[model samples]
Target: NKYTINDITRASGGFAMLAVDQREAMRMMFAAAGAPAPVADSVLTDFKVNAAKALSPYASAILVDQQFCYRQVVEQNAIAKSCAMIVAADEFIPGNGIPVDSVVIDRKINPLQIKQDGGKALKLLVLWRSDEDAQQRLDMVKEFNELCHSHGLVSIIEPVVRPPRRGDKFDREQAIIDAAKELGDSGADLYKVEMPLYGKGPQQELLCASQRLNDHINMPWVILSSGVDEKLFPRAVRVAMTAGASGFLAGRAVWASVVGLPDNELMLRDVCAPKLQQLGDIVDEMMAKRRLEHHHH
Candidate 1:
């Protein structure tokens, strides 16, 4: 039987997912926080596992990267039973000293193994550059969706915009909308998108922009927390949901602030856990309101 998006969402049908799939960027976060350069692999693994343990209870699904913590998390069984597992199946290619200069589906990720590991979904990061060939990106997503369906796993695609390689004038917001228009109906079970205006600007403007984005995406979409401020994330979640998003599948907004702290685990439990709970509550409430409106109509 094929798994659906519901495999990775709350009973209320809103996605309140946690992402801990950061690889090199996570090391950068640690280095910025005063961890010694070339942070040990174990440190990253420990953090991912701990985050899974401490925060997964509040999330409907927790996304773990194949490189750092997927094995440890599976072996240790760190994720809460209440949470579904999502494996990040995209491999980041480094170039010019940047962490993720390009992205491709990780051929090493075995969908059948992931299913056996209790992973209900796999997420792929598709980098959308104005200068790149659109057909290549579409073909890749099509293959990914087919691979996931072949093994009964849900496929989630995250399309992020990058400046063109040719140094052309670029409008980030327009690229975001264009990315959705191009690949939003690529047969992925879910579309994970960056928030418009970085989740800033006037509420009306954000709503309008998000609505425009909603128009382009055919499948259920959710927001990521990379560019948005943590404080603004709750509002972003609400605004996006109001504008037709299903919910959010996020990482940084949930745990970035507490990374590399002296009391990291303590903060993960005390600070981040409550924040995740609040975010989940927001998703559930917004979806609930949408259901009520649908019934009223």
Candidate 2:
């Protein structure tokens, strides 16, 4: 029921942080680690523009989706109100000057960079990654939410609910639930989380995860994309909604194959606008269909 057109954006702060050429920087850092010559990124600005322009298509129909997934991320912090949501700023990996890791980025976030623009309005959708423990991650939200409330901003701190660990690090239902509980009153208002996966086994995971963790039956869990493909997204959204997840959060999957897809504003607008509408409508359709199905049962 919380679904809205606000779910999508025309542009995002991600372009700014992602704008930096970290991949190239890593290469340079490695090559210079003990080499005769100092090394720097070959295409620092190119990478920046590459990052930014990659999403420039959104500018066409003027629909940019703000990648405000990381509260610690430099890009999201830079936009302020111009942003419609929050992924929180990006945080760096532990014990290092670098930011690339399974859980965190290397950037030290430049607060001075964000617009803090004249009159922008943005909401928050906090996300947890597989790399981070739920408790520690939720604790991070305690501080994050304080910052949000201090600035009169809205927020989400949904757990990264997903397939049980295939690797040793995967969190089980209990662990994620414990993390959400640890959040207590400090967690963000909404959850930008995962829903059930395909089939019965994952379905139970999603159902129990949402009910036990998201709410006692109120439904505030939001769905994130696996980024592998988009074909499953609509169905995925439906599953989440059916199981009580609130909404959707998409990243890599949306832009992964976006290459040569739509790089201009109009084209960007055409591609994304409908997608957003379709997603929003899906929420409506699912929730409605859910009622009919519920009655039949």
Candidate 3:
């Protein structure tokens, strides 16, 4: 049977996923936290593995990347049995010292091998730019969807916006809506999107913006944590869900601050793990309320 989005969500039918698939961005996190310059590959691998082991119990699914911890996590069986595993299939290309100047599907990812390794899903990151050709993005996502379906893996597509290379005036919020309108129904099992308004502003304003985003997406969608503040994430998840999002698949909001702490294990257990659990709770609560509303109808 083909793997579906159900394979990666809580029993409440809401997605509370964790992303540890960051590549160069993760290394930058370490550097920003006062770790020595030129963070070793092993350091990133260890953190990913440890985070998966410690936090998976609270996440419905955990996303790991081939460049860092996928092999190690599989070998060690680091993820909890209750948490589904998702492999990141998007390859990042650096340009002008920026970690992820562009993105493409990684041909190196073997879907059958990922299935054999107990992965239930694959996530692709699509960089959306106004100046770029829309057909190229659509074609790539079509291929990605076919790849996942051929191997019976659930497919998740993330479209994040960036300013065009031509230095056009950037409108990030509008770009987010434009991206959704462009790729929201590209046949991926799930659409992971950036929060409109950066998860800030008044509640009513955020809700209206999220509703506008919802209008474009024809598939189930969830918010990612990259541009959002950690403190505002729970409220953002609530607002998005109220506006038709299923839940959130996030990383930075849950574990970014705990990266290079002196007592890493303790912080992971006491700090990060609890935060994940809280986020999951929020998702489940929102989903349950929606279920009740559906029944009332």
Candidate 4:
């Protein structure tokens, strides 16, 4: 059975997700900023819980890491129960050059338990590269997809492109298209792609690029805002949706700058909430325009 928009989205009928599942990445950031030895788990928990608490009202869903703050988010009722919860299933292996280490899920997670804990979706991060074994990646995604489907949870697959080990030169533009071509048809509920070349170029150029990537994706896809500049993400969202993307499951472009701030809660309410609300409004506006055009045509 296919899932409806209501299953993936909230009452708004748009896909606007707040991703705070950066575990190793967050720890590295904390340590890099001289945040004392052995950056406590509470630090990660605080950022995620506060971000969820403050920003959940504006988002359809909030994606949190099971490793750090999933329990905290569920226990504290950090986000509104109305908002969908997505749990990140992959654990990051810190310390990397460019493409870090292999993405692996050593153990299986109980989806029933996830549902009992208030999670509606399971997110898996897959690294895509042209030089690597294609079958391996495909099998991994199919496995994850089936696991989520078995438990009636949404499987949100994130395919991030990386350079080939053999080639010194890497073409990001081509990688985005290739990644989608390979994983778009995989039966995952959603395809999460990195913004095409980080949302580069003029309007027409970005639109065409987004369209090319979208064409390869057989399933409904969303653009991730990791590489895109925060200020420019609004335009990226516009062009992407116009080219057939549903919405965004963005993190850095939205809240990366606020990581080490003094008043995280205040910053989340005053700053992040408005930004998320703005993105959500933009999605609504775009969908409205599409409907109007369709009706006129």
In every candidate, how many clashes are there? Answer: 0, 31, 0, 0
Segments of candidate 4 deviating more than 4 angstroms: 1-5, 95-100, 106-108
* 196-219: candidate 2 lDDT, tens digit per residue: 332134555645544554453232
Residue lDDT tens for model 3, 1-297: 688999999999999999999999899989999899989999999899989988999999999999898889999989999999999999999997899999989999999999988889999999999999999999999999999999999999999999998987899999999999999889899999999988998999999999999999999999998889999999999999999999998898888888888777778899898888988999999999998989999
Model 2, residue 129: what's the lDDT?
A: 45
Tens digits of per-residue lDDT for model 1, 25-120: 999989999998779989999999999999999999999998899999999989999899999889999997899999888999988888988889
Tens digit of lDDT per residue, candidate 4, span 201-264?
A: 7899999999998889998788899889889899999999999888898797777777777888
- For candidate 4, the TM-score is 0.94
Error of 4 at 43 (Å): 0.8
Candidate 4 residue 147 Cα shift, in angstroms, is: 0.4
lDDT, ranked from best to worst: 3, 1, 4, 2
How well does each candidate superpose onto the true structure, as a TM-score?
0.98, 0.53, 0.98, 0.94
Q: In candidate 1, how many Å is residue 173 off?
A: 0.7
Span of ten consecutive residues with least summed lDDT in model 4:
91-100
Which residue window of length 10 is worst by lDDT in model 2? Answer: 12-21
- How close to the true structure is residue 94 of candidate 2, measured as C-alpha lDDT? 26
- Give the better candidate number (2 or 4) by TM-score: 4
**Which scores greater on TM-score, model 1 or model 2?**
1
- List pairs with backbone clashes in candidate 4: none
